[PDB]
Design a protein around this nucleic acid. Structure first.
Length: 49
DNA sequence: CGAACCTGGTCTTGACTCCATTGCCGGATTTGTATTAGACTGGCAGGGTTGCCCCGAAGCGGGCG
């Protein structure tokens, strides 16, 4: 699970200081394409899936 | 009762040794400067991608003198 992991913060990706809370949220196009359960639990909720 | 003894510190003499310490002294290296003569004549360059708030500044529409 450290491979096959989707990340959302990099060069050209969204930094935490510019992170919008809309991108944190799941929405029903993740069904089958991402997992709403598994994500980091600290301040990086929803960015890393 | 008095006379020597050997030995502690306490100190002195003088000779010996040994090593710092400059002083050259000659050479090695190293730091800075100058000089290249055909002709050359205006840059690459991504972080920006928030949200909110306060505020300063431009700019134009609005009445105005």
């Amino acid at each position: 699970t450290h491979k096959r992991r989707l990340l959302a913060l990099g060069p050209g990706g969204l930094s935490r200081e510019r992170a919008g809370l809309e991108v944190r949220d799941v929405h029903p196009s993740h069904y089958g394409r991402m997992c709403p359960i598994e994500t980091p639990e600290g301040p990086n909720i929803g960015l890393i899936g």
